[model samples]
Target: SEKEELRERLVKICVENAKRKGDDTEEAREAAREAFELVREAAERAGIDSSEVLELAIRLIKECVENAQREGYDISEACRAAAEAFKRVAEAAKRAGITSSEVLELAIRLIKECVENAQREGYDISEACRAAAEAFKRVAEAAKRAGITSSETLKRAIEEIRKRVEEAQREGNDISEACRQAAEEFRKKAEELKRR
Candidate 1:
């Protein structure tokens, strides 16, 4: 399947690139150090089980790799640019004193903005959407931590997300199905959390 292939390709390129660099350079070591600190901070802040943003970074890196491969961009340049974009959005969201579903709603709007920007910049739209789904998962984890044991807020968030999906569809962006599915999955996860 295409989805499986994307995952596999992500792994393949990541390993290949890492192996090529061998992690022995001073810059490589410094990068690993910085990443370690960032991950440690994020885990502490979001709780030990929260690696959603880390996974988001991985997915974004994979998308950048794929785009570079297909579009003749420098792989390193693409990955760096994508990481910067994710960092900018993540930092902005982190500053908000928002609630469970509020955070979820914010992620949806951010994803919409990201997709629009990606299209304008000639990115692979599906891959852009795929990375956006990762943002959804991170927000889902945030929702869990918010201790939202009610369905009403979760449902409201899902509805709002769906509205954005409909808006995107009406604009003919080809993101309707992926965006809808991510929201549905988010609802399912939020419901499960409510029960626990």
Candidate 2:
């Protein structure tokens, strides 16, 4: 119930804010600020006490604004970008024409299995890191193309994996199994792009 309520509030605020700002510079700014305030109020009503959620929302909005400023995006352009991302993901799903959450799940499972098998053979950590990094990159890219909001998180994860890979390589360890496991994990995440 809370989730649904939050979703509805978000949709309402976004739509109303979009409408109010229609081609008016000052009105758009005022409306955007009001929309953000409404979001905070709605979340509070929904019992979302987690500061993390609020913080993330703020960060996303700020980042979006910063991106717009740097790239010269107006309010309409920003809205269009959001809409386009949604459309792309929807089209990807339509092309497949079947509901299957299998892609990501299978990828995750493969990563786990590979890591376990490699551990049994006492493979070097370096090898493991390399494998993981490659996998993470793929996941990051997929998430990006799908226009998932968590793209930043996925990219950070991939960076961590890459760091491990570099460490292993530096130690001259055999990273074949590790690399394989990472690949599996990345593949899974990449597939998740379709879901979003």
Candidate 3:
């Protein structure tokens, strides 16, 4: 498979050539430490630039995400998965060429939007959003010292329970135990976001 082929190539260049270990926490970081190093002469190992390797990443991600979304998959679920993969891809991106702030910045905004959109659509994205948010604690905390915004963001999240409870009580749009459960779960998330 092409992926295996690519993987073999990367490993040949990144690891087998020089033994090491790590995870997808920050592909960019991962690559910076090794990919940029002059392992063998360019002619010895196929000269692969960071630009060449990282360029196709977003395209591949878009395709995978769109296909998954088409099959009734949640967009953020894909976004989170994409984020994890993207983080790894970023490592390769850094090694490929002159790394810039543009691509990195865009990934941030795209990831943020997807997480919010998924939450807006009634999906339980607390786990995903929080995990990512932890990385952006500065932003979250900047909004409110501790970063946990119980007064605002989290409070608003809990408002969801009220909406579910009321919308269901209305004449015919009555909600369900699921809705109640959802409310509780939603509150739980907000609770975590709060400065408890």
Candidate 1 lDDT, tens digit per residue, 1-196? Answer: 5434434444466445544545223443333334334433543443331344455544655555454445444444444445444444455335433334344345545454455545455665446545564545544555656576555665466556556665665686545454555566665666677676
Evaluate all candidate structures by whole-model CA lDDT and list the values in order.
0.49, 0.41, 0.37
Better of 2 and 3 by TM-score: 2
Superposed by TM-score, candidate 2 places the C-alpha of residue 121 at a distance from the truth, in angstroms, of 44
Ranking by TM-score: 1, 2, 3
TM-score, per-candidate, Cα-based: 0.40, 0.28, 0.22
Cα RMSD of predicted structure 2: 15.9
Instruction: Work out how many backbone clashes candidate 2 has.
Output: 5
Per-candidate clashes, comma-separated: 0, 5, 10
Error of 2 at 151 (Å): 18
Clashing pairs in 2: 126-168, 127-175, 128-178, 131-179, 132-182
Give the Cα error of residue 137 in candidate 2, in Å: 20
Error of 1 at 67 (Å): 3.3
